[PDB]
Amino acid sequence: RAPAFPLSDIKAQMLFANNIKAQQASKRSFKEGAIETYEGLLSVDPRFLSFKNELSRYLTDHFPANVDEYGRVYGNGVRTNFFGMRHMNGFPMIPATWPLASNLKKRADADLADGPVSERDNLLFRAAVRLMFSDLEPVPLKIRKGSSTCIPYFSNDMGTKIEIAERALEKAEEAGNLMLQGKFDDAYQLHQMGGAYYVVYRAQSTDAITLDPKTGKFVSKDRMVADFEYAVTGGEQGSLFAASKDASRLKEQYGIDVPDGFFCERRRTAMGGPFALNAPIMAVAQPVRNKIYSKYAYTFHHTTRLNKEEKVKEWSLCVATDVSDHDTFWPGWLRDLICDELLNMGYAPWWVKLFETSLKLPVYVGAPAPEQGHTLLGDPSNPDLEVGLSSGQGATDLMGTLLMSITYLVMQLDHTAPHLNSRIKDMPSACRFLDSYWQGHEEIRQISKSDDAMLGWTKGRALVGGHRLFEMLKEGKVNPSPYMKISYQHGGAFLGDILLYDSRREPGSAIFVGNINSMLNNQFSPEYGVQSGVRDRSKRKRPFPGLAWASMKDTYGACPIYSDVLEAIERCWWNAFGESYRAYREDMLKRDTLELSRYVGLAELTPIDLEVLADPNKLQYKWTEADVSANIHEVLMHGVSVEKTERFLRSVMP
Ligand SMILES: [Mn+2]
């Protein structure tokens, strides 16, 4: 049972430096409220809400999901209903979950191993660690603009961040060594490395909604959560119940109009790391990305839909997988294994302790619901939580791939390719086979970014077993992996793009198109608002919203129903607004096109560049620095001197 501490306690007090921003953060209470969907327009505006009500009914009606029995998609490309938009963007379900403080039991109760099952697996994992963290080229420590440093200073002034980051890369060794001696408080008080994660709550504005033919009433997807007790005890006591998306309280409290079939939005937990501890970790994680997005680009680097469609055309079978709640599930033991191999490889113990510790840190829960929260979970003096993986750890994306890639590969050997076992006899042979399999220069294949992936089998012996596996995944009775809960994706798609099979449901005559539902989400149910209160747009969550219209075609036009939907959209946006959506959007576009230039027409920019500028969160799951124009990059990022990261990195590696 995890130690808990009220905001009042000395232990949580020193999470928050002596200034307003920081103190405000320790204290900050629940906050709901309509979002400025677009400039001058509220998410709960009676017209906008009526627009949604009709657009979703009509679209789900005239274009029902065309999805296979094996979760392959065909026909119109619609993988589901359009009811997503039926949320009161800004008003959150209540309560949000308390971050679970130990997944040890969660994993057990799920039948997932507490470590590698077989020495083979133990080799493949360690191989991944080797191939990932070896032969690294130093780069600048690129700092995202606008981002917070969280515990302890809670600043978001680039100048301050640069200084902290540089300072960190200096005294990072001193601190790691201090952690090795077990003096974590000493390390934190001297270098603000340790302490805790800061538990914000992100919105996810497009969770599931269904329309019961029986009921005729709408049905929000149930989303379970943990009351404090459940979370501190990893599931022993406490209860795990569903939160209320019921949006009526919206009327009572704020007098707002609540149409039939609208709900509050799902809220996922998000963590914010002590920047001073992420700095030394990012200086390494970024190079690692570089090595893999190049050398092992077949399985890891994903840009354009051709780039995807190409690799898959060659496959004889394609299986889109899916991972349940990947993050709260991430094995604690993989961290310890990854940390061992690093040590073995010769990585400097101190830097591994920073890494080890960054994955065992207490989390500070802010505001799950009104009158809940303001609590530190676990003791910063001796960090030992098993949160799983934390959204804001320096290497969090790599941590998902390292795990999940091997997990899949194993799943392939396990059910399709036993004859490759001979190939993995020892460490060296392991890498060799891994280094092979990761380039896709092998008969079983994989493209993946952490929890999203598609698995492929070329012609060959495995090919038959592959099909067996597909079947095991359809019946969904047996879990194929011992490491994570894995299933097929009902409506197969990879990194935002839908795989559109055809008449012959074969990966050859398949083609990647974009998800049309995603467009409707981006355009009408935005994560954040326009932030007019914020002056510098590069500091805003959506800097140049208009710009997305420019890349609409270059992105969604590939969809079977793209045209119709643009016409449906335009139509309904008339019945509700009198105006013309196309005009409204073109009006936004022209505006921000001028505005943009003070921060650097669009002749130059790429189709991506725009999507990024309209929402830079797509650097956080979709694309990468290499994918964006180097001059557009400096608008959303600023780095730390390369001299400084190079010297640092030189002390870390072997
Ligand atoms: Mn998928």
XYZ file of C-alpha atoms and ligand atoms in Angstrom:
655
model
C 0.000 0.000 0.000
C 1.490 3.277 -1.191
C 2.337 6.154 1.169
C 0.003 9.114 0.718
C 0.468 12.734 1.689
C -1.873 15.736 1.833
C -0.798 18.915 0.043
C -0.164 20.277 3.536
C 2.544 17.738 4.286
C 6.185 18.804 4.123
C 6.873 16.004 1.633
C 4.472 17.354 -0.998
C 5.259 20.942 -0.070
C 8.765 20.741 -1.473
C 7.322 19.680 -4.810
C 6.297 23.280 -5.337
C 8.900 26.042 -5.395
C 8.424 29.420 -3.730
C 6.532 31.364 -6.409
C 3.001 31.922 -7.678
C 2.991 29.656 -10.746
C 4.253 26.794 -8.604
C 2.036 27.439 -5.615
C -0.956 27.908 -7.879
C -0.221 24.492 -9.317
C -0.090 22.754 -5.957
C -3.408 24.347 -5.098
C -5.307 24.283 -8.378
C -8.862 23.078 -8.227
C -11.346 21.513 -10.620
C -12.120 23.551 -13.723
C -14.764 22.989 -16.389
C -16.140 25.335 -19.019
C -17.062 25.638 -22.679
C -14.140 25.894 -25.084
C -13.662 28.430 -27.855
C -13.955 25.742 -30.544
C -13.105 28.446 -33.082
C -12.559 32.190 -32.694
C -15.805 33.653 -31.381
C -17.614 30.298 -31.124
C -18.327 28.174 -28.032
C -18.303 24.385 -28.021
C -21.739 24.419 -26.409
C -23.204 27.059 -28.709
C -26.855 26.101 -29.487
C -26.162 26.362 -33.228
C -22.894 24.391 -33.169
C -24.621 21.770 -31.010
C -27.544 21.556 -33.425
C -25.021 21.278 -36.258
C -23.375 18.320 -34.564
C -26.733 16.681 -33.782
C -27.730 16.642 -37.462
C -24.346 16.073 -39.085
C -23.727 12.942 -37.031
C -27.184 11.468 -37.516
C -27.063 12.065 -41.256
C -23.507 10.774 -41.693
C -23.983 7.617 -39.633
C -27.216 7.039 -41.514
C -26.057 7.500 -45.127
C -22.615 5.898 -44.462
C -22.742 2.940 -42.056
C -19.416 1.410 -41.112
C -18.092 -0.917 -43.828
C -16.021 -3.249 -41.636
C -15.004 -6.867 -42.182
C -15.435 -9.763 -39.775
C -11.677 -9.681 -39.343
C -11.572 -5.956 -38.743
C -10.395 -5.254 -42.251
C -12.061 -2.159 -43.660
C -13.573 -1.837 -47.133
C -16.148 0.048 -49.181
C -16.640 3.583 -47.893
C -13.747 3.501 -45.411
C -15.981 4.345 -42.481
C -14.963 2.170 -39.546
C -17.596 3.381 -37.116
C -20.391 5.844 -36.447
C -19.841 9.587 -36.472
C -21.441 10.138 -33.086
C -18.045 10.995 -31.641
C -18.692 14.710 -31.918
C -21.674 14.514 -29.545
C -19.697 15.796 -26.569
C -19.734 19.015 -24.558
C -16.066 19.696 -25.311
C -14.789 21.404 -22.179
C -17.019 19.722 -19.635
C -15.343 16.566 -18.351
C -16.744 13.301 -17.164
C -16.579 13.108 -13.376
C -14.535 11.844 -11.657
C -11.280 11.115 -13.449
C -9.204 8.129 -12.400
C -6.625 8.304 -9.684
C -3.402 7.120 -11.192
C -2.883 3.583 -10.049
C 0.214 3.447 -7.933
C 1.121 -0.198 -8.683
C 0.275 -2.318 -11.697
C 1.868 -5.425 -10.198
C -1.498 -6.967 -9.308
C -3.341 -5.420 -12.237
C -0.926 -7.330 -14.474
C -1.242 -10.595 -12.544
C -5.031 -10.543 -12.473
C -4.778 -10.125 -16.247
C -2.506 -13.121 -16.752
C 0.564 -11.183 -17.847
C 4.063 -12.383 -16.906
C 6.180 -10.750 -14.214
C 9.219 -11.036 -16.468
C 10.518 -12.745 -19.582
C 8.900 -16.179 -19.841
C 11.625 -17.977 -21.763
C 15.346 -17.281 -22.200
C 14.657 -16.582 -25.870
C 12.336 -13.734 -25.010
C 14.874 -12.570 -22.460
C 17.312 -12.295 -25.347
C 15.063 -10.525 -27.826
C 14.215 -7.859 -25.265
C 17.852 -7.319 -24.368
C 18.707 -7.287 -28.051
C 16.234 -4.487 -28.600
C 17.947 -2.564 -25.819
C 21.313 -3.071 -27.476
C 20.290 -2.229 -31.023
C 18.525 0.842 -29.680
C 21.092 2.418 -27.371
C 24.308 1.706 -29.239
C 26.222 3.824 -31.719
C 24.414 7.107 -30.975
C 24.954 10.419 -32.753
C 24.662 13.481 -30.470
C 22.129 16.179 -31.421
C 20.755 19.344 -29.828
C 18.447 18.926 -26.862
C 15.401 20.417 -28.569
C 12.995 22.037 -26.094
C 9.339 22.405 -26.995
C 8.181 26.031 -26.687
C 5.394 26.811 -24.225
C 5.924 23.613 -22.224
C 6.124 23.642 -18.406
C 9.039 22.495 -16.236
C 6.669 21.368 -13.502
C 8.143 20.225 -10.222
C 9.532 22.200 -8.763
C 9.586 25.624 -10.463
C 6.579 25.369 -12.801
C 7.983 27.842 -15.298
C 7.388 27.994 -19.019
C 9.879 30.686 -19.960
C 12.244 29.342 -22.627
C 15.170 31.240 -21.154
C 14.625 29.604 -17.807
C 14.115 26.195 -19.412
C 17.340 26.463 -21.418
C 19.226 27.328 -18.244
C 17.690 24.493 -16.231
C 18.353 22.061 -19.069
C 21.967 23.118 -19.421
C 22.412 23.176 -15.663
C 20.881 19.690 -15.576
C 23.205 18.229 -18.213
C 26.029 19.496 -16.029
C 25.106 18.299 -12.562
C 23.278 15.223 -13.875
C 26.243 12.974 -13.091
C 26.603 14.393 -9.594
C 22.934 13.591 -8.948
C 22.818 10.095 -10.363
C 25.776 9.154 -8.186
C 23.888 10.623 -5.245
C 20.866 8.462 -6.101
C 23.128 5.409 -6.199
C 24.102 6.205 -2.596
C 20.384 6.282 -1.914
C 20.355 10.010 -1.180
C 17.356 10.930 -3.323
C 16.400 13.958 -1.280
C 19.936 15.175 -1.547
C 19.685 14.774 -5.304
C 16.384 16.608 -5.502
C 17.238 19.489 -3.206
C 20.485 20.112 -5.074
C 19.372 19.445 -8.607
C 15.586 19.158 -8.643
C 15.897 15.583 -9.882
C 13.279 13.359 -8.299
C 10.265 14.517 -6.360
C 7.226 13.630 -8.421
C 5.241 13.668 -11.620
C 2.443 16.217 -11.814
C -0.887 14.636 -12.680
C -2.851 16.834 -15.088
C -5.888 15.569 -16.929
C -6.055 15.685 -20.742
C -9.312 15.709 -22.631
C -10.247 13.129 -25.217
C -13.162 14.732 -26.982
C -14.140 11.856 -29.223
C -14.765 8.767 -27.116
C -17.401 6.247 -28.199
C -21.109 6.909 -28.528
C -23.711 4.455 -29.739
C -27.386 4.766 -30.617
C -29.432 1.876 -29.241
C -31.994 0.810 -31.836
C -33.925 -0.470 -28.865
C -33.639 2.659 -26.741
C -33.650 5.299 -29.475
C -31.587 7.082 -26.840
C -27.852 7.733 -27.078
C -25.295 5.813 -25.031
C -21.908 7.131 -23.938
C -19.163 4.529 -23.594
C -18.655 3.478 -20.023
C -15.210 4.423 -18.764
C -14.124 2.865 -15.479
C -11.921 4.656 -12.939
C -10.315 4.182 -9.516
C -11.319 5.869 -6.303
C -8.306 6.900 -4.234
C -8.344 3.675 -2.198
C -8.177 1.430 -5.249
C -5.241 3.397 -6.645
C -3.040 3.480 -3.528
C -3.593 -0.259 -3.042
C -3.173 -1.337 -6.657
C -6.587 -2.973 -6.528
C -6.770 -4.753 -3.163
C -9.370 -2.563 -1.464
C -11.118 0.310 -3.231
C -13.631 -0.008 -6.078
C -13.347 0.368 -9.821
C -16.450 2.085 -11.140
C -17.683 3.891 -14.194
C -17.644 7.690 -14.322
C -20.674 9.771 -15.236
C -20.526 11.354 -18.670
C -24.128 12.457 -18.004
C -24.209 16.080 -19.169
C -27.360 17.267 -17.369
C -25.465 18.711 -14.418
C -24.355 21.142 -17.117
C -27.818 22.705 -17.197
C -28.330 22.839 -13.438
C -24.934 24.460 -12.738
C -24.123 26.719 -15.687
C -27.620 26.998 -17.105
C -26.273 25.698 -20.409
C -28.472 24.070 -23.039
C -27.992 20.297 -23.142
C -29.453 18.644 -26.267
C -30.573 15.038 -26.414
C -27.612 12.715 -26.843
C -24.686 14.833 -25.675
C -22.265 13.869 -22.938
C -19.240 15.016 -21.018
C -15.858 14.160 -22.501
C -13.541 11.360 -21.434
C -10.538 12.460 -19.414
C -7.254 10.489 -19.552
C -4.581 11.068 -16.908
C -1.440 12.863 -18.059
C 1.771 13.251 -16.084
C 4.352 16.056 -16.033
C 7.924 15.175 -15.163
C 10.454 17.212 -13.194
C 12.125 18.880 -16.185
C 15.539 18.799 -14.524
C 15.365 14.988 -14.594
C 13.998 14.703 -18.109
C 16.697 16.901 -19.599
C 19.503 14.321 -19.207
C 17.074 11.638 -20.349
C 15.934 13.501 -23.456
C 19.541 14.184 -24.440
C 19.783 10.433 -24.954
C 16.265 9.452 -25.959
C 16.341 11.833 -28.924
C 19.526 10.301 -30.391
C 18.023 6.819 -29.858
C 15.013 7.858 -31.914
C 17.406 8.993 -34.621
C 19.198 5.637 -34.775
C 15.930 3.728 -35.052
C 13.971 6.057 -37.369
C 16.817 5.602 -39.853
C 18.477 2.187 -39.566
C 15.380 0.308 -38.500
C 13.101 2.599 -40.440
C 11.174 -0.249 -42.020
C 9.367 -1.077 -38.834
C 9.651 2.300 -37.083
C 9.651 5.309 -39.467
C 6.196 6.212 -40.770
C 5.484 9.319 -42.831
C 3.136 9.263 -45.810
C 0.458 6.738 -46.671
C 2.494 5.505 -49.631
C 5.386 4.951 -47.225
C 2.957 2.651 -45.394
C 1.006 1.204 -48.342
C 4.359 0.212 -49.878
C 5.642 -2.004 -47.067
C 2.253 -3.716 -46.723
C 1.494 -4.359 -50.420
C 4.327 -6.910 -50.298
C 2.825 -8.792 -47.371
C 0.622 -11.842 -47.899
C -1.275 -11.409 -44.618
C -1.837 -8.266 -42.586
C -3.020 -8.232 -39.011
C -3.839 -4.965 -37.304
C -3.364 -5.483 -33.579
C -4.446 -3.437 -30.563
C -3.365 -3.076 -26.943
C -5.672 -2.634 -23.981
C -4.710 0.290 -21.752
C -1.069 -0.084 -22.778
C 0.247 2.492 -20.368
C -1.046 1.471 -16.972
C 0.017 -2.059 -17.953
C 3.666 -1.510 -18.981
C 5.748 -3.992 -17.071
C 7.968 -2.687 -14.294
C 10.380 -5.504 -14.991
C 11.065 -4.316 -18.535
C 12.408 -1.115 -17.045
C 14.716 -3.076 -14.801
C 15.790 -5.302 -17.714
C 16.384 -2.330 -20.030
C 18.420 -0.820 -17.202
C 20.474 -3.971 -16.735
C 21.409 -4.295 -20.399
C 22.346 -0.627 -20.526
C 24.582 -1.183 -17.519
C 26.066 -4.279 -19.189
C 26.653 -2.405 -22.429
C 28.736 0.046 -20.398
C 26.359 2.951 -19.936
C 27.349 5.081 -16.956
C 25.637 3.729 -13.818
C 24.629 7.223 -12.709
C 22.732 7.940 -15.925
C 20.928 4.626 -15.609
C 19.907 5.492 -12.065
C 18.358 8.700 -13.355
C 16.629 6.564 -15.970
C 15.650 3.870 -13.471
C 14.357 6.479 -11.044
C 12.455 8.431 -13.684
C 10.348 5.285 -14.114
C 9.727 4.785 -10.383
C 8.709 8.294 -9.358
C 5.833 9.298 -7.097
C 3.006 11.102 -8.873
C 1.223 14.170 -7.522
C -2.489 13.990 -8.158
C -4.006 17.403 -8.851
C -7.738 17.616 -9.465
C -9.622 14.427 -10.476
C -12.971 15.900 -9.475
C -14.272 18.817 -7.457
C -13.108 18.463 -3.837
C -10.843 15.522 -4.636
C -7.079 15.524 -5.094
C -4.112 17.594 -3.958
C -2.277 14.489 -2.848
C 1.221 13.095 -3.341
C 1.358 9.330 -3.981
C 4.487 7.461 -2.854
C 7.569 8.703 -1.013
C 9.985 10.868 -3.063
C 12.691 10.014 -0.555
C 12.718 6.445 -1.793
C 10.889 6.264 -5.165
C 9.284 2.860 -5.741
C 6.012 3.194 -7.597
C 4.818 0.929 -10.381
C 2.619 3.406 -12.242
C 3.389 1.580 -15.424
C 4.616 4.007 -18.044
C 4.140 7.742 -17.444
C 2.992 9.967 -20.290
C 5.754 12.473 -19.645
C 8.942 10.495 -19.097
C 11.940 11.492 -21.180
C 11.859 8.291 -23.222
C 8.248 7.249 -22.843
C 7.680 6.578 -26.558
C 10.794 4.402 -26.849
C 9.702 2.565 -23.728
C 6.507 1.550 -25.487
C 8.228 0.436 -28.628
C 11.073 -1.406 -26.931
C 8.402 -3.340 -25.063
C 5.710 -3.785 -27.611
C 7.887 -4.521 -30.638
C 9.506 -7.519 -29.006
C 6.135 -8.535 -27.565
C 4.784 -8.791 -31.102
C 7.853 -10.451 -32.582
C 7.578 -13.053 -29.823
C 3.895 -13.464 -30.614
C 4.913 -14.242 -34.192
C 7.552 -16.843 -33.336
C 5.085 -18.304 -30.835
C 2.228 -18.928 -33.211
C 3.777 -18.792 -36.675
C 7.546 -19.214 -36.795
C 9.021 -21.805 -34.403
C 11.644 -22.571 -37.017
C 13.348 -19.249 -36.358
C 14.114 -20.226 -32.761
C 17.333 -21.890 -33.904
C 18.377 -18.471 -35.147
C 18.282 -16.988 -31.652
C 20.758 -19.040 -29.622
C 22.830 -16.442 -27.784
C 23.115 -12.670 -27.414
C 25.065 -12.060 -30.656
C 22.819 -14.293 -32.789
C 19.860 -12.577 -31.148
C 20.815 -9.113 -32.299
C 21.654 -10.473 -35.733
C 18.173 -11.959 -36.013
C 16.636 -8.882 -34.460
C 18.631 -6.483 -36.643
C 17.361 -8.566 -39.547
C 13.721 -8.656 -38.456
C 13.655 -4.936 -37.735
C 14.677 -4.072 -41.309
C 11.867 -6.330 -42.473
C 14.461 -8.315 -44.378
C 12.581 -11.336 -42.905
C 9.545 -13.566 -43.603
C 7.614 -12.214 -40.644
C 7.323 -8.448 -40.373
C 6.088 -5.564 -38.318
C 5.456 -1.844 -38.626
C 4.733 -0.150 -35.340
C 4.772 2.884 -33.067
C 4.277 1.483 -29.583
C 0.685 0.269 -29.076
C -0.365 0.773 -32.718
C 1.056 -1.780 -35.151
C 0.347 -3.988 -38.128
C 1.903 -7.428 -38.458
C 2.765 -9.000 -41.776
C 3.664 -12.392 -43.162
C 5.322 -12.862 -46.529
C 4.889 -16.148 -48.351
C 6.661 -18.915 -46.493
C 6.233 -21.488 -43.747
C 4.983 -19.070 -41.118
C 2.383 -17.718 -43.542
C -0.027 -20.550 -42.643
C 0.457 -20.124 -38.902
C -0.082 -16.418 -39.349
C -3.603 -17.124 -40.548
C -4.118 -19.371 -37.507
C -3.117 -16.447 -35.301
C -5.551 -14.121 -37.085
C -8.265 -16.624 -36.233
C -7.147 -16.846 -32.590
C -7.517 -13.074 -32.493
C -10.993 -13.063 -33.989
C -12.483 -15.628 -31.609
C -10.920 -13.532 -28.872
C -10.955 -16.268 -26.257
C -7.252 -16.882 -25.794
C -4.687 -14.161 -25.211
C -1.747 -14.754 -27.644
C 0.914 -12.978 -25.615
C 1.978 -13.552 -22.000
C 3.100 -9.908 -21.736
C 0.177 -7.661 -22.725
C -3.501 -8.028 -23.591
C -3.525 -8.192 -27.389
C -6.466 -8.345 -29.792
C -7.274 -7.564 -33.381
C -8.299 -4.005 -34.312
C -11.956 -3.838 -35.335
C -11.459 -1.542 -38.284
C -7.809 -1.893 -39.178
C -5.744 1.278 -39.350
C -2.185 2.359 -38.575
C -1.120 5.811 -37.391
C -4.274 7.718 -38.322
C -4.611 6.055 -41.736
C -7.157 3.363 -42.542
C -6.090 0.287 -44.520
C -8.746 -0.054 -47.215
C -8.846 -3.624 -48.453
C -11.063 -4.355 -51.456
C -13.177 -7.088 -53.014
C -10.450 -9.686 -52.420
C -9.539 -8.617 -48.892
C -5.843 -9.092 -49.650
C -2.989 -6.785 -48.524
C -1.832 -6.566 -52.129
C -4.817 -4.691 -53.574
C -5.259 -2.804 -50.319
C -4.573 0.917 -50.054
C -4.017 3.319 -47.188
C -6.424 6.232 -46.976
C -7.043 8.631 -44.097
C -9.718 8.142 -41.459
C -12.584 10.481 -42.384
C -13.854 10.389 -38.801
C -10.576 11.948 -37.713
C -11.309 15.037 -39.826
C -14.646 15.613 -38.169
C -12.916 15.290 -34.823
C -10.179 17.765 -35.646
C -12.553 20.301 -37.145
C -15.435 20.234 -34.681
C -14.184 18.535 -31.538
C -10.719 20.010 -30.828
C -8.700 18.961 -27.774
C -7.922 22.513 -26.676
C -9.466 25.879 -27.573
C -8.109 28.747 -29.665
C -6.516 30.508 -26.686
C -7.122 34.175 -27.548
C -5.846 35.146 -24.097
C -2.450 33.834 -25.085
C -0.514 36.439 -27.158
C 2.303 34.473 -28.744
C 0.674 31.934 -31.014
C 3.709 29.663 -31.012
C 2.932 29.281 -27.295
C -0.703 28.293 -28.024
C -1.870 24.678 -28.256
C -3.389 25.465 -31.652
C -1.249 28.306 -33.090
C -2.766 28.674 -36.586
C -6.038 26.704 -36.679
C -7.056 28.074 -40.039
C -3.987 26.506 -41.646
C -5.500 23.023 -41.393
C -7.958 23.793 -44.170
C -5.051 24.128 -46.578
C -3.902 20.553 -45.975
C -7.391 19.060 -45.763
C -7.363 17.785 -49.352
C -3.739 16.674 -49.187
C -4.801 14.435 -46.288
C -8.410 13.285 -46.415
C -9.133 13.480 -50.160
C -8.018 9.850 -50.402
C -11.212 8.755 -48.622
C -14.064 7.163 -50.577
C -16.628 9.541 -49.029
C -14.422 12.624 -48.555
C -16.364 14.659 -51.083
C -19.808 13.735 -49.766
C -18.795 14.558 -46.196
C -17.547 17.975 -47.250
C -20.958 18.479 -48.822
C -22.852 17.070 -45.870
C -20.749 19.299 -43.618
C -21.414 22.368 -45.743
C -25.135 21.564 -45.956
C -25.808 21.150 -42.229
C -23.580 24.131 -41.362
C -26.206 26.104 -43.267
C -29.275 24.867 -41.418
C -27.578 25.961 -38.202
C -25.550 29.032 -39.101
C -27.025 30.472 -42.313
C -23.420 30.999 -43.449
C -21.175 28.812 -45.559
C -18.702 26.504 -43.861
C -16.419 26.611 -46.909
C -16.360 30.375 -46.617
C -16.013 30.337 -42.845
C -13.003 28.042 -43.230
C -11.438 29.919 -46.126
C -11.857 33.066 -44.071
C -9.955 31.507 -41.193
C -7.300 30.245 -43.601
C -6.493 33.554 -45.278
C -6.238 35.233 -41.857
C -3.750 32.886 -40.247
C -1.715 32.733 -43.460
C -0.767 36.379 -42.966
C -0.465 36.014 -39.200
C 1.929 33.094 -39.715
C 4.500 35.160 -41.580
C 5.251 37.353 -38.559
C 6.529 34.113 -36.870
C 8.905 32.968 -39.615
C 1.459 32.536 -48.957
C 2.013 28.895 -48.057
C 3.715 27.962 -51.318
C 6.668 26.724 -49.252
C 5.045 24.682 -46.476
C 4.362 20.946 -46.791
C 0.949 19.291 -46.244
C 2.272 18.102 -42.869
C 3.859 21.426 -41.900
C 0.367 22.859 -41.893
C -1.228 20.058 -39.894
C 1.580 20.540 -37.369
C 1.190 24.318 -37.151
C -2.553 23.839 -36.639
C -1.826 21.337 -33.865
C 1.732 20.517 -32.695
C 0.506 17.576 -30.607
C 1.098 15.631 -33.808
C 4.807 15.726 -32.971
C 3.740 13.784 -29.880
C 2.329 10.666 -31.540
C 2.232 11.116 -35.307
C 5.395 12.591 -36.795
C 8.943 13.639 -35.999
C 11.393 16.513 -36.358
C 12.672 15.074 -39.641
C 9.125 15.125 -41.041
C 8.780 18.910 -40.621
C 10.490 21.750 -42.439
C 13.586 22.792 -40.484
C 12.499 26.445 -40.635
C 8.987 25.675 -39.426
C 10.580 23.704 -36.594
C 12.100 26.833 -35.000
C 8.594 28.262 -34.719
C 7.488 25.563 -32.307
C 10.835 24.526 -30.817
C 14.101 25.991 -29.616
C 17.074 23.834 -28.796
C 19.930 23.788 -26.332
C 23.442 24.279 -27.698
C 24.884 21.189 -29.376
C 28.252 21.738 -27.696
C 26.541 21.192 -24.350
C 24.534 18.072 -25.257
C 27.544 16.538 -27.048
C 29.828 16.816 -24.029
C 27.040 15.465 -21.824
C 26.184 12.578 -24.103
C 29.874 11.784 -24.297
C 29.828 11.065 -20.575
C 26.773 8.858 -20.774
C 27.559 6.332 -23.465
C 30.507 3.906 -23.612
Mn -3.996 -0.353 -35.444
